[PDB]
C-alpha cells in the first residue's frame, strides 16, 4: 500500500489497481474497488461485446457500415480518413479499440443498443460493476462522484480475463479480441512502458482529459510465465488536474513488482 500511497501524493490525485497473476492466482490490490472513469477504455470491451453478437450473427464483422459525416464526432481520425467508402464492422472494431476512434465506436455503440446495451452484455458475462451511460464525447466528463461510464480496477481486470483468457468468447473471437488488443497504438507509455520489448502485450487505454483521469488496461506475457492481467485507472479532484502517462506506468511497475514480476535484467 504504501508506495501507492507515495505515488498517489506525487501525482496528486488516486490512483486504482488490480493486477492478477492467472498462473498462481496472486493479487494486487488499491482501490481496486472504487469507480473511475472508463473514458475510451470502454472501446475495448465493445469490441469484445461486438465480437460475441458475430458468433450469433453471420457475417457481421463484414458488414459494411456506410456513414455520413454526421456520425464524424471529434478525434474519429479513422473514420474521416474512410468516409468515401465506409468501414466493415471488423474495421469500425479494430479502429475503437487500436486508435480509439469517437465516430466508430458511436456507430458500433449504435450496432448493439447503445451504453445500455454494452452495460448489458458486461452483465451477461457476470460483471457487475461495470456501467456505460452515455455516447462519444458526453461520457468522458469524469466529474468526481459521479458514477455514470465507471467501473472499478476489480472488474476491469476481471472481465479482460474472462474474455482474453476465459471462456467468455468462442476461441477464433477470442484471438481476435488479444489481436487487436496487442496492436494498439496508443499504449506506449502506460502498461507496455513497464515491461521489456519483448514481453507481449495487448492492452487498451483511456484518457479523459479533465479531472487527472487517465487508465490502461492489459494482458501481459511475460518470457517462460503464465500471463499478467492488469488494470490502472487514476482520477484527480481538480477539473484542470492533468493525467499522467508516467504515473500510469509506474503503478503498472508496482503492481507487477508485487507479483514477483519485474523487467529487471
Not at 464492422?89 to 447503445?114: F, H, P, R
Request: aromatic letters at 8%; one cysteine or more; proline letters at 5%.
Amino acid at each position: 500500500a504504501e508506495p501507492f500511497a507515495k505515488l498517489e501524493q506525487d501525482f496528486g490525485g488516486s490512483i486504482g489497481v488490480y493486477a492478477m497473476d492467472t498462473g498462481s492466482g496472486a493479487t494486487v490490490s488499491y482501490r481496486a474497488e472504487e469507480r473511475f472513469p472508463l473514458c475510451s477504455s470502454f472501446k475495448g470491451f465493445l469490441a469484445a461485446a461486438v465480437l460475441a453478437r458475430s458468433q450469433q450473427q453471420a457475417g457481421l464483422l463484414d458488414t459494411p457500415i456506410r456513414y455520413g459525416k454526421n456520425a464524424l464526432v471529434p478525434w474519429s481520425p479513422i473514420s474521416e480518413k474512410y468516409l468515401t467508402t465506409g468501414m466493415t464492422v471488423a474495421e469500425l472494431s479494430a479502429a475503437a479499440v487500436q486508435y480509439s476512434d469517437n465516430a466508430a465506436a458511436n456507430l458500433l455503440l449504435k450496432e448493439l443498443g447503445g451504453p445500455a446495451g454494452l452495460t448489458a452484455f458486461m452483465r451477461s458475462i457476470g460483471d457487475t460493476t461495470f456501467r456505460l451511460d452515455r455516447w462519444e464525447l458526453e461520457l468522458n466528463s469524469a466529474i468526481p462522484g459521479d458514477a455514470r461510464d465507471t467501473s472499478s480496477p476489480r472488474a476491469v481486470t476481471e472481465s479482460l480475463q474472462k474474455l482474453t483468457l476465459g471462456s467468455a468468447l468462442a476461441a477464433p473471437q477470442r484471438q481476435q479480441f488479444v489481436d487487436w488488443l496487442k496492436g494498439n497504438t496508443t499504449g506506449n507509455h502506460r502498461i507496455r512502458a513497464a515491461v521489456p520489448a519483448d514481453w507481449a502485450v495487448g492492452d487498451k487505454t483511456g484518457t479523459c482529459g479533465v479531472y487527472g483521469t487517465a487508465n490502461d488496461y492489459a494482458v501481459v506475457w511475460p518470457t517462460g510465465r503464465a500471463p499478467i492481467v492488469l488494470a490502472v485507472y487514476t482520477r484527480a479532484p481538480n477539473k484542470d488536474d492533468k493525467h499522467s502517462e508516467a504515473v500510469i506506468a509506474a503503478a503498472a511497475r508496482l503492481a507487477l513488482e508485487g507479483l514477483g514480476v519485474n523487467g529487471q535484467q
